[PDB]
Scaffold this active site. Structure first.
Site, PDB file in Angstrom:
ATOM      1  CG  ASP A 247      -1.984   0.993   1.198  1.00  0.00           C
ATOM      2  OD1 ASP A 247      -2.602   1.225   2.257  1.00  0.00           O
ATOM      3  OD2 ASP A 247      -2.222   1.547   0.110  1.00  0.00           O
TER       4      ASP A 247
ATOM      5  CB  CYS B  11      -5.558  -1.298  -4.473  1.00  0.00           C
ATOM      6  SG  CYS B  11      -5.925   0.342  -5.094  1.00  0.00           S
ATOM      7  CB  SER B  12      -7.015  -0.747   0.374  1.00  0.00           C
ATOM      8  OG  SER B  12      -7.801  -0.831   1.566  1.00  0.00           O
ATOM      9  CB  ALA B  13      -8.189   3.770  -1.619  1.00  0.00           C
ATOM     10  N   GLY B  14      -8.760   1.756  -4.233  1.00  0.00           N
ATOM     11  CA  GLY B  14      -9.083   1.719  -5.657  1.00  0.00           C
ATOM     12  C   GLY B  14      -8.591   2.950  -6.420  1.00  0.00           C
TER      13      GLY B  14
ATOM     14  NE  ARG C 165      -2.163  -0.901  -3.040  1.00  0.00           N
ATOM     15  CZ  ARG C 165      -2.458  -1.648  -1.976  1.00  0.00           C
ATOM     16  NH1 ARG C 165      -1.729  -2.740  -1.726  1.00  0.00           N
ATOM     17  NH2 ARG C 165      -3.463  -1.310  -1.164  1.00  0.00           N
ATOM     18  CB  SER C 166      -6.644   0.737  -8.843  1.00  0.00           C
ATOM     19  OG  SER C 166      -7.010  -0.327  -7.972  1.00  0.00           O
TER      20      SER C 166
ATOM     21  CD  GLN D 143      -3.739   8.489  -3.096  1.00  0.00           C
ATOM     22  OE1 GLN D 143      -3.711   8.653  -1.878  1.00  0.00           O
ATOM     23  NE2 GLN D 143      -4.210   9.419  -3.945  1.00  0.00           N
TER      24      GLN D 143
END
Ligand SMILES: O=C1C=C(c2cccc(O)c2)S(=O)(=O)N1
Ligand SMILES: [Mg+2]
Length: 297
Positions: A180, A214-217, A220-221, A261
């Site tokens: 992350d 991913c977690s927040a999208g 990484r997405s 991010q």
């Protein structure tokens, strides 16, 4: 041109400034539905919401909200659905979305647990004999098989609309070694994985948009989609110099906030595209080289 630009930025050590400029220029659209009281428990993070104009609507009269955005890349001619890692109460919604949008593949770039906390619900079955039933959306999900590699796993799932008994094969591509707010181990590993997804047909126009999360999208997405779109664009006219990575990222940010991010994810995005360009421009053997360097076996 990106490689010369890459050198200029690296030399002047200004990735932080370049990255911050993109944030300053990024689109700002309302996310009113996401902020409605009734949807508070459908959002994993308070500051990460889908814009209303590009959000994916569930085909239910009840509540059509899911934290997912359709990134439609006109020039590149490819679409992606970016979403957050499903929550314990939104796994049925997630699969309802996969069904209604006719997606063939789901790309997961995170682990269920990262840095000691739960980043995503266990939304798919881990054992063949333990299938999952999402009663709220009347969908059944069965693990058919899985191929575990060193840093990613590919699973074949069968999704069934219990209402019509219609079934579909969903391919799940799980990148397991991407931290992350971090970057992949090397452009090689990342590219080997992206090309694995491409070769499966999951990103093809005959299917609905691939679902990426991913977690927040967004981090990484965003990195995954930016790299893919840039490579497809230079493939369209075999002109790597015509592709402006920052411009493409800004275009994607019109569909979902915060794509990419950190400054290092941006820098990594350049590395992936520049290295990937060798394949696009005719050096087919480089794919084997990536596989080797990725150490997937
Ligand atoms: O590299 C990242 C950072 C993310 C993140 C996670 C929580 C909040 C946020 O703003 C970004 S992600 O799951 O979209 N990928
Ligand atoms: Mg078993």
């Amino acid at each position: 041109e990106m490689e010369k630009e890459f050198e200029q930025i690296d030399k002047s050590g200004s990735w932080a400034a370049i990255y911050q400029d993109i944030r300053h220029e990024a689109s700002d659209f309302p996310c009113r539905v996401a902020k409605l009281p009734k949807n508070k428990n459908r959002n994993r993070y308070r500051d990460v919401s889908p814009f209303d104009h590009s959000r994916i609507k569930l085909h239910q009269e009840d509540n059509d909200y899911i934290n997912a955005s359709l990134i439609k890349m006109e020039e590149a001619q490819r679409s992606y659905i970016l979403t957050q890692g499903p929550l314990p109460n939104t796994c049925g919604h997630f699969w309802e979305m996969v069904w209604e949008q006719k997606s063939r593949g789901v790309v997961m770039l995170n682990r269920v647990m990262e840095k000691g906390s739960l980043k995503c619900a266990q939304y798919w079955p881990q054992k063949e004999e333990k299938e999952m039933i999402f009663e709220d959306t009347n969908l059944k999900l069965t693990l058919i098989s899985e191929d575990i590699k060193s840093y990613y796993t590919v699973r074949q799932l069968e999704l069934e609309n219990l209402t019509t008994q219609e079934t579909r094969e969903i391919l799940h591509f799980h990148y397991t070694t991407w931290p992350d707010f971090g970057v992949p181990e090397s452009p090689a590993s990342f590219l080997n994985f992206l090309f694995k997804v491409r070769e499966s047909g999951s990103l093809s126009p005959e299917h609905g948009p691939v679902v990426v999360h991913c977690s927040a999208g967004i981090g990484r997405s965003g990195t995954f989609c930016l790299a893919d779109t840039c490579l497809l664009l230079m493939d369209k006219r075999k002109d790597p110099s015509s592709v402006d990575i920052k411009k493409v990222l800004l275009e994607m940010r019109k569909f979902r906030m915060g794509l990419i991010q950190t400054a290092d994810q941006l820098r990594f995005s350049y590395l992936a595209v520049i290295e990937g360009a060798k394949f696009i421009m005719g050096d087919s053997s480089v794919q084997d080289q990536w596989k080797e360097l990725s150490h997937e076996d």
